Amino acid sequence: DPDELPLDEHCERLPYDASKWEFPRDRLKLGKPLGRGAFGQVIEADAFGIDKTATCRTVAVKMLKEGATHSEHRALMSELKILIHIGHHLNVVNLLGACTKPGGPLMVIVEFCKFGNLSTYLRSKRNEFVPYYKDFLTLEHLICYSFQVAKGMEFLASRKCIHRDLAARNILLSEKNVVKICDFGLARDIYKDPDYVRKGDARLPLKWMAPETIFDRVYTIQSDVWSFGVLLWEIFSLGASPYPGVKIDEEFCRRLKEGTRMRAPDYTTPEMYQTMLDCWHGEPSQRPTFSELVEHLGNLLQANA
């Protein structure tokens, strides 16, 4: 049903309103790289007056790199188009502008998120965590981050988009404990990153993928719910790697379809662990929706206080 169909499958027909989004290249001061893949990269920049008149703003710019071809260039343009269609939400990395004019590289300019990816950040805070000390993480923070990602994903779903690589490495942490969903995409070196496992010609985030995705190449909002459950485990393990000590092979995939699930992580509550189990239902339609996750996590956040 084309009304169920994720926008992004048909990105090429979406509009690029240059009068709204185009940002002069001479108003962008490029700085240090923030991430590089084989074909893409993100670099830090200072943008003069991109979102507020005459004010310097630190931003992140996604662009291509040596190795990329015309097809990566097309892909980045369609990424720009989907970000415009999606629009602004607190809990999604916000598009600020683009440089698309001939003579320079295509640049997709988004907000800079001070503390980087959530996995790395949580893993740095094992010694600065208490369940209930300024700058210490607490159980409240962790539940709050969970709630925030569910809000951003509910928003993504409302825009008829799905994620396909939802994981703590694709959550950014800003000031004031705001987390933002992103997708590094081409700016991540998936061939060097052990989170992506060779499967055919592709390198795939198998530990985050729902059984229907692994076996039938089916991507839906409900397979995103499965990944959200894995993200929850990452949050409540303070950034540990999923399925610890487990070879990700055909027998891993088999046991998963059979019903094997991860054990509770070190910092979880019982109801957070049950929520992970819910997200990991074998049948996609029996998983909670993001709207249901929002309501439930909102209740947990309230109960925690």
Hey, which residues are catalytic here?
165
172 touches ligand BAX (CB under 6 A): yes
CB of 78 or CB of 289, closer to ligand BAX: 78
Measured at CB, which residue is nearest to ligand BAX?
A: 182
CB of 160 or CB of 203, closer to ligand BAX: 160
Within residues 176-195, the interface with ligand BAX by CB under 6 A covers: 181-184
233 touches ligand BAX (CB under 6 A): no
Within residues 16-75, the interface with ligand BAX by CB under 6 A covers: 34-35, 42, 60, 62
Q: Spell out where 179-264 has E strands.
A: 179-181, 197-199, 202-204
Within residues 92-131, the interface with ligand BAX by CB under 6 A covers: 92-93, 110, 112-113, 116
Token look-up 């629009």 returns 87
CB of 36 or CB of 281, closer to ligand BAX: 36
Do the Cβ atoms of 168 and 239 come closer than 8 Å? yes
Annotated binding-site residue? 36 = yes
Do the Cβ atoms of 95 and 83 come closer than 8 Å? yes
Within residues 151-170, the interface with ligand BAX by CB under 6 A covers: 156, 161, 163
139-140-142 Cα angle (round to 5): 65
Do the Cβ atoms of 146 and 137 come closer than 8 Å? no
Minimum CB distance to ligand BAX, residue 181 (Å): 4
Instruction: To the nearest 10°, report the CA torsion of 201, 206, 212, 216.
Output: 10
Minimum CB distance to ligand BAX, residue 152 (Å): 7
d(CA 114, CA 190): 23
What's the token pair of residue 189? Answer: 């070196």
CB of 187 or CB of 256, closer to ligand BAX: 187
Minimum CB distance to ligand BAX, residue 85 (Å): 10
79 touches ligand BAX (CB under 6 A): yes
Residue 209 C-beta-side C-alpha neighbours within 13 Å? 22
Question: 57-87 as b/e, with b when 16 or more CB fall inside 10 Å?
Answer: bebbbbbbbeebeeebeebbbbbbbbbbebe
Binding site for ligand BAX (CB under 6 A): 34-35, 42, 60, 62, 79, 82-83, 86, 92-93, 110, 112-113, 116, 156, 161, 163, 172, 181-184
